[PDB]
A paper describes a structure:
Structural studies involving temsavir and related analogs indicate that these compounds bind to Env within a conserved binding pocket that partially overlaps the CD4 binding site, i.e. utilizing the pocket where Phe43 of CD4 is normally inserted (referred to as the Phe43 cavity). By binding within the interface between the nascent bridging sheet and the gp120 inner domain, temsavir stabilizes the closed Env conformation and prevents CD4-induced conformational rearrangements of the inner domain layers that lead to the formation of the bridging sheet which is necessary for coreceptor binding.
With these two chaperone Fabs, we were able to get relatively high-resolution structures of the trimer including a structure of the temsavir bound-T/F100 LMHS SOSIP.664 and temsavir bound-BG505 SOSIP.664 complex to 3.1 Å and 3.0 Å resolution respectively, where the densities for temsavir were well defined enabling us to make an unambiguous placement of the compound. However, the angle of opening for the temsavir bound LMHS SOSIP.664 was significantly lower than that observed for fully open, CD4-triggered Env (the angle of rotation/opening is 18.29° for the CD4 bound BG505 SOSIP.664). Indeed, in the temsavir bound LMHS complex, the conformation of the β20–β21 loop changes significantly as compared to the unliganded LMHS structure with the loop needing to move away to accommodate temsavir. β20–β21 loop movement can be measured by the changes in the position of Trp427 at the entry of the temsavir binding pocket, 3.1 Å and 5.7 Å as calculated between the Cα and Cγ positions for the unliganded and bound complexes respectively. Interestingly, in the temsavir bound LMHS complex, the β20–β21 loop caps the temsavir in its pocket from the top and Trp427 directly lines the pocket with its side chain indole making contacts to the compound’s piperazine group to lock the compound in its bound conformation.
Numbering used by the authors:
A (entry chain J): 522 to 545, 559 to 662
B (entry chain I): 33 to 134, 152 to 185, 187G, 188 to 309, 312 to 321, 321A, 322 to 358, 360 to 396, ...
C (entry chain K), I (entry chain C): 1 to 35, 35A, 36 to 52, 54 to 77, 77A, 77B, 77C, 77D, ...
D (entry chain L): 1 to 30, 30A, 31 to 107
E (entry chain F): 521 to 542, 566 to 662
F (entry chain B): 521 to 547, 565 to 662
G (entry chain E): 79 to 127
H (entry chain A): 264 to 309, 312 to 314
């Protein structure tokens, strides 16, 4: 859930424990009707379910599987970004960063998938 | 070296549109009184506020493009239709009425169907002059909507009492509230706070004056789409409420006739006591004070000219008169005395404005689908605030500000001007030095 | 739609001052809009001057202390108006001037970035020579 | 504080040919913060491309742009008289947002 | 959710948890649609909690949170040898929210520490 | 979830199994005729994924494309050796061949996962 | 499909027949099935004569 | 939509005389249809509304 | 429904040729069906000759180079017809014959496996002795 979004990336990274804690509801009451209000709840349920399922579907394919801080062995290519760790984590907010690197999200996702599946294949070889 | 790391739960959002459901208060409406608005089905009862203050975040808000107002307009039109679908048809009543040529009852004589299809009956009813239109002693007359709409009786038990409805958002979406004083709903907003969903808002509708609404914080503030075009209406929001008390004092009766198998048309009945027409009382001093403040505020944004308030020119009876319902009967009061002072003597006496009740209501900005409201059988008395006026400019020095109304969306813009739904994007990618898995 | 208008051509002399007013027909307000001032010397490349953004005015170093920015939004009779006037004019200010706009309602569009932005609409332009 | 140059400054062109114009930046504009203008003789410039490759509304589709690191290019295919004019490259990444040197296209 | 073995003490039932598991609008059709959403919604909720605490698909999940005696006072043998599951969950029904929060916080703290080790 | 590369044998398709996930993203409030169909379609997809992920989860693979399970091969389920299973038999052919022993395989996998879970707690004491 | 009944051993439950919601659901479902089946059928209003 | 290479006759049972034969054509034949004489529409009010 | 009818019986002598044709009433087409030729024996178990499957004729290793198989599907007046020809006739050919079909529309049924299939519907049979 959104909150304290004005802080920089470094300041808000140590407060991610608060965001995750305290239940990171409504519309759970069964109705079984077709009135004006009876259909909007039925659609809201599906909207929430699809959103959460899509997010967890994207998360799983990279080997994160429900962890907030997901580390990956994918090198950083300078074409996606130039700025150093300080200029990224000291004077830039998350909205600013995600707007800056919005042209290289698809490639990042694809590369993460390649890396995960290649790492998965390497292990089977070691086991044999 | 740096390596891609993935974070779930980062603070990022983008503007979006959703389906916002309804939540009402604790008291379930299974009290045997069922409203047109179906608040009982708004089963999501509202447990707690849960607000968070976004700090150092600025947002841009434009009230005229909000989708929240557009959704409400549709839901309210639909709830009314749903309520009147199982109600009496009223088609037998479109017949020539023989009314005495000797508001005003003119009571008339008509022939109507009895329960047995073969037989006919002659019935007499008191019909308000506003709903009967002459067709060309004892001259003939016809109902007003015979030629353009089908009229359906309101079911008697249903209550038109307006109760607060809170609109709420599904997970993955949030609502943002501006929290800024004097916020003419357009421009950057400083202390945006994340609210779980909107506060209680009453689905009341009125033409010329807004009753029972929310009050501003700092002062009287003007809100309009384009402050240059004369075809756009100006909405004023007050920071203090004038009080209007309205009553129909006669003691009337309801008598029911059988127009078919199982169908009853309830007609008006003879009065006991014959009191004068309904009126409405509005404190003169407070009204003139708030009118002067509104005049000064208008002088601020309109080149420091002199502001003249004039009475409404003409149109449908809704547009030219203040319109509302006291306890299920809509009556339209004459508001000339309230708006005639060129503000930049003031009379302190209680102002009493005449009201003429009507019965056959017509749909706003539509074709067909009229409604009939039965009597109440008792005396009525409702007390209310007034916290807004709607005015529309006439230009071609001084300025002419004709009172306006009729658009049913504009009644809620003073209550939904400070909300904006934003989709939440939790995923994010950032570089750091961990490099494993 | 959107349309911009400025004043007419004016011929001045060194040591004087000149005025240029911008009137936008289509900009609902300057609260969620921005106006950028740009100067084009004859044949030379376009040059940036200054802006007012969220009712905050500023200018580049080459024009700091020599340019003035003001703006008034919707009025009951007049459209939003922005004004630029040169102070202590010199012989090197002989160039056309232009009034620009952009839309700032959505962060994610790509026409603006932290106050530095492109220019969606351009005025007809006024010529000032000395 | 950030400068750009573009070449060719003046280039001949003919109807039906495809022309490629490139503007080079001093630094690495990795955010794709580059815009293109075209002005007719004695006319104010008009925005055509923003964010590297995004078309505006009511714009011919033959204008195309590609962004990669330092090399930003604008490709115009099937030129017409409505398309001859003077072109500009701008970056808006660091305050102040400056302009390019200015390139002009002449017929034949 | 195995009903059956619900009248046994906690230790016995724990051993026997060998296996966990395995449009039209008309009066019936709407009911069938509501029944589907109810199940999907329910499964997701338990999974969301489990995963936040780090369990992720294990029927028995070991967590680092210590036990505070203000939640319970009894010994391992009293709790496991003579208390059935519906009795224990009713006996500690006042400290489930705090327990959930403590496990969430502990999982996040462990998650943060690992990044430090990887540098 | 892939269609395409169905003709090839196991040895060819398995190399591109990585590609199946790799190349792509992989994997109403109206009572009109089209609107209800859309509602049914949305529920069908969510429900299917969750059933598939629920089946995958119980064996402890937890959302990974190739999962190794410590379950020995029973000669009743099949006879052919690794070369003649992975060199000339397509996936559809194999899944049709061993369609009589999927339930027993699932049960054995679940029991083995539960036993491994129990054996882990003992080590931790 | 095939029934699966499992005996709960050593478990006692309390039952009250007059508070069951299962009976209340049935009453509504049967009232609504009859209404749906007779909605597309001849009106018979000319008969009352 | 026209077929790709040749005229194709498709039918459910080429033996039964009670089954229709559908023919698909490689190329199209063009038919133009018109009602030459223009008429007027007038509206009569048969009820309220 | 499904019904099979073959030709009549023949009595011949070695060094000749004879053909038996089955006419299936119920097979929509042989494209998604298959015809299997099986020869019963005077006292022994049944044997396999060959088949037509997706219009790909084949025969057993003990009948290759002698037996020929052909088939024509639905026509305007006649049902699908499949035929078997015995060339270089000998005393060992004194046995009944059958023409059989099994459905091939679904892979997952279990009535076929990589072209080697069961025998669902059987004809009456034609005794042939020499
Ligand atoms: C909805 O609700 C919201 C919220 O309430 C509401 O928003 C409000 O809108 C108001 C508009 O209606 C808005 O008020 C205007 O604000 C303007 C911004 O003013 C700021 O900047 C100026 C300039 O800043 C310079 O200079 C100062 C001092 O020199 C310096 O300290 C600064 O740092 C900055 O210098 C920097 O820039 C220089 C270049 O400019 C550079 O050289 C320097 O080196 C340095 O980098 C400050 O002076 C202010 O104090 C503010 O900080 C403001 O400009 C504008 O003033 C005009 O209107 C006033 C009346 O309201 C007049 O009194 C005033 O004189 C201005 O009028 C002149 O301009 C108009 C426009 O052309 C012209 O027509 C007039 O005739 C007049 O011209 C005469 O004066 C000018 C000199 O100004 C001469 O050049 C001419 O020749 C003439 O002589 C307004 O005051 C308000 O801020 C805003 N509030 C909020 C909270 O958002 C919104 O309007 C509502 N919506 C609706 C529809 O109503
Ligand atoms: C919908 O649209 C689709 C697409 O168009 C359409 O599909 C088409 O359907 C067609 C049918 O309508 C179909 O055409 C038939 O194909 C038959 C298969 O032909 C193949 O096999 C034969 C035999 O193969 C043998 O022999 C050769 C040479 O000796 C050898 O090289 C082979 O390897 C194989 O030998 C193997 O088996 C032997 C035993 O069988 C064994 O001894 C060997 O050692 C070895 O192991 C080949 O000859 C072909 O070249 C093909 O490769 C085909 O048999 C059939 O031919 C019949 O019809 C023709 C006219 O179309 C005639 O010209 C021809 O003579 C056949 O007619 C005989 O059979 C009928 C059956 O009753 C009989 O009535 C006739 O009188 C005649 O019999 C007489 O002659 C034979 C000798 O030929 C004698 O034995 C008899 O006793 C009689 O004297 C068809 O040609 C087509 O393939 C198909 N297309 C596709 C792409 O799938 C579909 O039909 C449409 N649907 C509808 C409803 O319209
Ligand atoms: C709130 O409501 C107000 C009132 O409705 C509204 O203001 C009006 O906005 C419209 C735009 O929607 C304005 O119309 C434009 O006006 C300009 C300027 O006209 C002024 O000057 C003339 C001459 O002195 C006066 O007669 C006039 O009254 C104004 O004072 C015109 O130049 C525009 O012309 C364009 O449209 C023509 C068709 O009408 C076309 O011929 C052509 O497209 C014109 O643009 C062309 O101009 C270029 C030259 O500069 C040319 O080179 C290009 O090829 C280009 O195509 C247009 O008529 C109107 O004047 C405004 N009126 C007032 C009183 O303000 C607000 O906009 C509205 N606010 C919002 C937010 O909607
Ligand atoms: C496309 O449409 C066509 C036309 O409708 C259709 O062709 C017809 O199919 C039907 C089957 O549905 C065929 O009817 C069968 O025909 C056989 C063969 O009879 C031949 O010989 C007689 C006598 O010489 C002729 O009169 C006849 O025309 C044929 O040439 C019959 O043997 C079948 O008899 C069964 O039906 C009897 C009732 O009529 C029952 O008493 C009994 O079930 C018979 O079967 C029994 O026979 C066994 C002995 O052999 C017995 O032991 C068993 O108990 C078994 O039950 C039946 O009448 C009809 O002939 C076809 N006509 C033509 C012109 O083709 C196609 O089938 C259809 N295609 C598709 C895909 O649907
Ligand atoms: C970085 O990402 C942003 C997206 O966040 C991206 O901006 C997008 O660029 C595309 C490519 O030009 C834009 O798509 C065009 O938008 C215009 C707007 O009017 C349309 O007219 C275009 O349609 C024409 O072309 C189509 C294909 O030929 C035709 O089918 C059609 O009929 C039209 O002729 C086209 O859709 C897109 O609008 C923007 N998005 C935004 C929000 O601006 C940007 O390009 C990326 N950066 C780089 C360097 O690629
Ligand atoms: C009353 O107008 C209808 C009449 N009839 C129907 N019908 C439904 N079924 C059929 C056959 N007709 C209607 N449906 C929706 C209707 C509306 O929402 C609608 O216009 N307003 C909402 C209620 N309101 C008022 O309170 C109000 C205030 C001051 C004066 C008069 C009325 C008017 C506007 C509607
Ligand atoms: C909002 O209401 C307050 C009082 O409720 C008004 O405050 C008074 O305003 C008048 C004239 O504006 C002043 O003379 C008084 O001194 C004010 N009272 C106090 C206590 O300060 C205020 O005017 C209202 N808002 C507007 C825009 O008029
Ligand atoms: C950046 O490097 C990655 C390797 O991690 C590569 O896949 C990608 O294509 C590179 N980017 C470009 C624009 O070549
Ligand atoms: C962000 O970068 C600028 C570079 O000019 C630097 O001056 C500033 O201090 C940085 N922000 C913080 C919070 O250090
Ligand atoms: C009404 O019906 C009566 C029949 O009882 C008839 O006599 C009378 O004329 C009718 N009214 C009119 C106005 O015709
Ligand atoms: C925004 O509103 C909150 C509560 O109304 C207040 O505490 C806060 O100070 C306000 N923001 C500013 C900048 O004053
Ligand atoms: C309206 O009623 C209220 C309370 O009953 C009263 O205080 C007020 O004075 C009344 N209005 C007038 C104009 O008397
Ligand atoms: C409004 O009403 C009268 C009627 O025309 C008008 O002349 C006058 O200006 C206003 N009333 C008073 C009391 O001033
Ligand atoms: C000359 O220029 C300076 C700087 O712009 C200005 O402040 C000053 O008032 C001007 N003085 C004269 C003589 O105009
Ligand atoms: C017991 O420990 C928990 C966390 O370990 C703590 O939240 C709680 O307050 C403690 N109880 C007491 C009585 O201190
Ligand atoms: C558990 O306690 C009850 C009563 O306190 C006792 O009867 C029972 O024997 C105890 N359990 C065991 C295993 O002894
Ligand atoms: C499949 O098996 C057969 C016999 O077991 C063998 O002849 C054939 O070569 C195998 N397929 C391949 C591709 O090697
Ligand atoms: C059908 O049309 C194609 C070209 O459109 C032609 O080549 C072909 O011969 C036609 N079919 C027949 C059966 O002639
Ligand atoms: C044909 O008749 C229609 C209807 O009167 C009319 O609108 C139209 O103009 C006529 N056309 C000609 C060619 O007369």
């Amino acid at each position: 859930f959104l909150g304290a979004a004005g802080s920089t990336m470094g300041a808000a990274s140590i407060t991610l424990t608060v965001q995750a804690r305290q239940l990171l509801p409504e519309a759970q009451q069964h109705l079984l009707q077709l009135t004006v209000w009876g259909i909007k709840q039925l659609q809201a349920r599906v909207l929430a379910v699809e959103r959460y399922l899509q997010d967890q579907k994207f998360l799983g394919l990279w080997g994160c599987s429900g962890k907030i801080i997901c580390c990956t062995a994918v090198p950083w290519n300078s074409s996606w970004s130039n700025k150093t760790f300080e200029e990224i984590w000291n004077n830039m907010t998350w909205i600013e960063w995600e707007r800056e690197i919005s042209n290289y999200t698809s490639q990042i996702y694809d590369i993460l998938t390649i890396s995960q599946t290649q790492q998965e294949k390497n292990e089977k070889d070691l086991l044999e | 070296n740096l390596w891609v790391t993935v974070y779930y739960g980062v603070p990022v959002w983008r503007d979006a549109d959703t389906t916002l459901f309804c939540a009402s208060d604790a008291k379930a409406y299974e009290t045997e009184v069922h409203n047109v608005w179906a608040t009982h089905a708004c089963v999501p009862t509202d447990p707690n506020p849960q607000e968070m203050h976004l700090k150092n975040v600025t947002e841009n808000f434009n009230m005229w493009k909000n989708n929240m107002v557009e959704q409400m307009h549709e839901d309210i039109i639909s709830l009314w239709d749903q309520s009147l679908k199982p109600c009496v048809k009223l088609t037998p009543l479109c017949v020539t009425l023989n009314c005495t040529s000797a508001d005003d009852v003119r009571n008339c004589s008509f022939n109507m169907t009895t329960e047995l299809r073969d037989k006919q009956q002659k019935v007499y009813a008191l019909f308000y002059k506003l709903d009967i239109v002459p067709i060309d002693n004892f001259s003939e007359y016809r109902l007003i909507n015979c030629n353009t709409s089908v009229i359906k009786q309101a079911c008697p038990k249903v209550s038109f009492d307006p109760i607060p409805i809170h609109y709420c958002t599904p997970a993955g979406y949030a609502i943002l509230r501006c929290n800024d004083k004097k916020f003419n709903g357009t421009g950057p907003c400083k202390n945006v706070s994340s609210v779980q969903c909107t506060h209680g808002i009453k689905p009341v509708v009125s033409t010329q004056l807004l009753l029972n609404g929310s009050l501003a914080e700092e002062g009287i503030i003007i809100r309009s789409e384009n402050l240059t075009n004369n075809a756009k209406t100006i909405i004023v929001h007050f920071n203090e409420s004038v009080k209007i008390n309205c009553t129909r004092p006669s003691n009337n009766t309801r008598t029911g006739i059988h127009i078919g198998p199982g169908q009853v048309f309830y007609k008006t009945g003879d009065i006991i006591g014959d009191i004068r027409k309904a009126y409405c009382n509005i404190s003169g001093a407070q009204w003139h004070k708030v009118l002067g403040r509104v005049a000064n505020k208008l002088k601020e944004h309109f080149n420091n000219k002199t502001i003249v308030f004039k009475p409404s020119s003409g149109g449908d009876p809704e547009i030219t008169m203040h319109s509302f319902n006291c306890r299920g009967e809509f009556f339209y009061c004459n508001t000339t005395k309230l708006f005639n002072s060129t503000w930049g003597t003031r009379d302190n006496g209680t102002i009493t404005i005449p009201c003429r009740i009507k019965q056959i209501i017509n749909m706003w900005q539509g074709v067909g689908q009229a409604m009939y409201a039965p009597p109440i059988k008792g005396v009525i008395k409702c007390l209310s605030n007034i916290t807004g006026i709607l005015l529309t400019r006439d230009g071609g020095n001084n300025e002419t500000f004709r009172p306006g109304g009729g658009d049913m969306r504009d009644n809620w813009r003073n209550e939904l001007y400070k909300y904006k739904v934003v989709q939440i994007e939790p995923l994010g990618i950032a570089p750091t030095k961990c490099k494993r898995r | 739609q959107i349309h911009l208008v400025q004043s007419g051509t004016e011929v001045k002399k060194p040591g004087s001052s000149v005025t240029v007013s911008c009137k936008a027909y289509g900009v609902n307000t300057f609260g969620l809009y921005a106006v950028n001032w740009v100067r084009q010397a004859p044949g030379q490349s376009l040059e940036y001057i200054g802006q007012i953004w969220r009712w905050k005015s500023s200018a580049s170093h080459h024009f700091r202390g020599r340019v003035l920015i003001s703006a008034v939004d919707l009025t009951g009779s007049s459209p939003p108006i922005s004004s630029l006037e040169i102070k202590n004019l010199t012989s090197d200010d002989t160039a056309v001037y232009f009034c620009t706009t952009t839309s700032t309602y959505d962060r994610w569009s790509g026409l603006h970035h932290d106050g530095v932005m492109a220019f969606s609409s351009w005025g007809q332009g006024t010529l000032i020579s000395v | 504080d950030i400068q750009m140059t573009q070449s060719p400054s003046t280039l001949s062109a003919s109807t039906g040919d495809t022309v490629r114009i490139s503007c080079r930046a001093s630094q690495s504009i990795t955010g794709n913060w580059v815009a293109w203008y075209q002005q007719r003789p004695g006319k104010a410039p008009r925005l055509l491309i923003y964010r590297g490759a995004a078309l505006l509304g009511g714009v011919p589709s033959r204008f195309r742009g590609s962004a990669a690191g330092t090399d930003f290019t604008l490709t115009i295919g099937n030129l017409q008289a409505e398309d001859f004019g003077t072109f500009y490259c701008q970056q808006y990444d660091t305050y102040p947002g400056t302009f390019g040197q200015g390139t002009k296209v002449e017929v034949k």
